[PDB]
Design a protein around this ligand. Structure first.
Ligand code: B2M
Ligand code: B2M
Ligand code: B2M
Lengths: 203, 203, 203
């Protein structure tokens, strides 16, 4: 039947392998699919890897199901954005009168929501920058800095990350995107893991 | 009027936000402008972020005023350069007779001084390599590795960093570079911060 | 006659500078040349910097002689590769019945061996990804992520790392590749260090 997606540590006695959804459920403006996991670098929990995510800015983080998130991956939300229609210097931060120059919410750049799809593998130490969408089945190389969208079933890498090549032929990608195995009843997934693992699920 | 730029920790209760000028006061061959700050990640002080800066090589670091330096930024001076007209292997390091092959001063590459302008925002974890000049008003993306110069009021990013686009039109940039608001006494700046923040200062 | 290549710490009183060969000699499927050294970041030993190297995968790591490996360099062997003929999701990791879906050895991607040549300088915090070959006399810039081969006597840099330019003219490179000074008797090396350092060995 497989592991329990509501355990933060699905494997008894193992504090490195973590299910993301139950860890992040307390968080506003975050949605995470079942079974998506974090492979911890030093025992740290995955909530510590999500940076500058402030409810006031109303940006959303969404992660699909069956993702593999490598150790040290960080997700950067919009909270560190500076005002930039003029000086980026945050006079307001320093007070003694300068707090009158606090930016209005509509003066702060918002890059958008961050959306990671289903069955996505994010390599070790990748930085996901604000407003990025990563398509189902993508693979992001270790140490990438993702600043723009990545299409489904692409291998991508670098800083700035770029799409390197499609993982499979277009027909295969099309069929995978249509069938969406990640959305099947879990008992049906279980019956078909071998075929999900070798792509024969589309045959 | 804002805080005193000579105060190491200008935000009350906060021992992470640091004015860099008073933090770096003890260091030779370092010139730093007022109001420029370091957004410490863990309370570490910005002097620990300046690497391989050795008086004998006589390279200089200069940082302008009103810069925003994100957490983890490192500035690499010339002290880790290897000799490269032949083997890069530093035989001299090992002593035991090999110290006679110490490079003479004019045998070591010096990439130049490092000069960061005024009103520059440098994102989290950026690495500034030896000899680079970054123009007034530039913005460097988080996780960039800056190996060549960045022109004024450019957005730049990547590893190696490249200019992405101009922040403002050329005429606006030209006017900002003429007016140099950062050089005004703070009691004059204080009367104009809103115009500095929205670029109408040029009018 | 120079330092002792069998000392882990060849410099008395110094626990940072390390000779790599004696440290790694205990390791299966690793070969390292004499005098190649690691410039430790926090006192960590260089064995800690070789990641995911498992004898069962039978990938090999080779490093030549007289290499300079900067602080924080990591070498990534093949052991963290996900199966990717279909889903990259490691169902088997989680037990609870999914353990039956363990990948066969022949289902795990193998990028190849990692081979670093002689007289190679790898800069601070470089990541060497699986399967990469780096030719004799190459220089890899700090913070590079090396994903493909680097030719001999190339300057290379970036993420992904690309060749920037040849260090010397082609004839000089070919002469150095023929001479192989790193393979000379140690007494002959000692007689000629200044010429190895200024490249006049080619004459
Ligand atoms: C065997 C193989 C080949 C590749 C592959 O063909 N990579 N090609 C180029 C490449 C480019 C970057 Cl910017 C980074 C990495 Cl690690 C690459 O391998 C691969 C790519 C990712 Br992304 C993840 C796993 C991979 N495995
Ligand atoms: C809304 C916005 C857009 C941009 C923008 O148009 N970025 N364009 C590309 C881009 C390129 C890299 Cl190499 C890295 C990042 Cl983070 C980018 O956003 C932006 C760039 C930086 Br530098 C800093 C803040 C920014 N904010
Ligand atoms: C004086 C000098 C110039 C160079 C040089 O001409 N570099 N050119 C470009 C460059 C490109 C990347 Cl992607 C990274 C760095 Cl640090 C570079 O210097 C140099 C390059 C490496 Br690699 C190592 C040491 C170097 N030293």
């Amino acid at each position: 039947m497989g592991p329990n997606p509501m355990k933060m540590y699905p494997i008894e006695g193992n504090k490195s392998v973590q299910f993301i959804k139950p860890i992040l459920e307390k968080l506003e403006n975050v949605e995470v699919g079942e079974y998506s996991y974090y492979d911890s670098k030093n025992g740290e929990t995955f909530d510590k890897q999500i940076l500058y995510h402030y409810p006031i800015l109303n940006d959303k983080l969404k992660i699909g199901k069956f993702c593999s998130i490598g150790p040290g991956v960080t997700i950067i939300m919009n909270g560190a954005n500076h005002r930039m229609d003029g000086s980026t210097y945050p006079f307001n931060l320093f007070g003694n009168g300068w707090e009158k120059h606090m930016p209005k919410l509509d003066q702060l750049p918002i890059k958008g929501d961050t959306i990671i799809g289903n069955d996505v593998w994010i390599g070790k130490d990748v930085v996901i920058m604000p407003g990025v969408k990563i398509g189902d089945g993508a693979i992001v190389a270790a140490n990438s800095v993702v600043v723009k969208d990545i299409a489904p079933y692409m291998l991508a890498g670098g800083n700035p990350a770029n799409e390197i090549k499609q993982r499979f032929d277009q027909d295969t990608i099309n069929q995978l995107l249509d069938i969406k195995w990640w959305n099947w009843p879990i008992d049906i997934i279980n019956e078909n893991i071998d075929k999900i693992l070798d792509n024969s699920i589309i045959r």
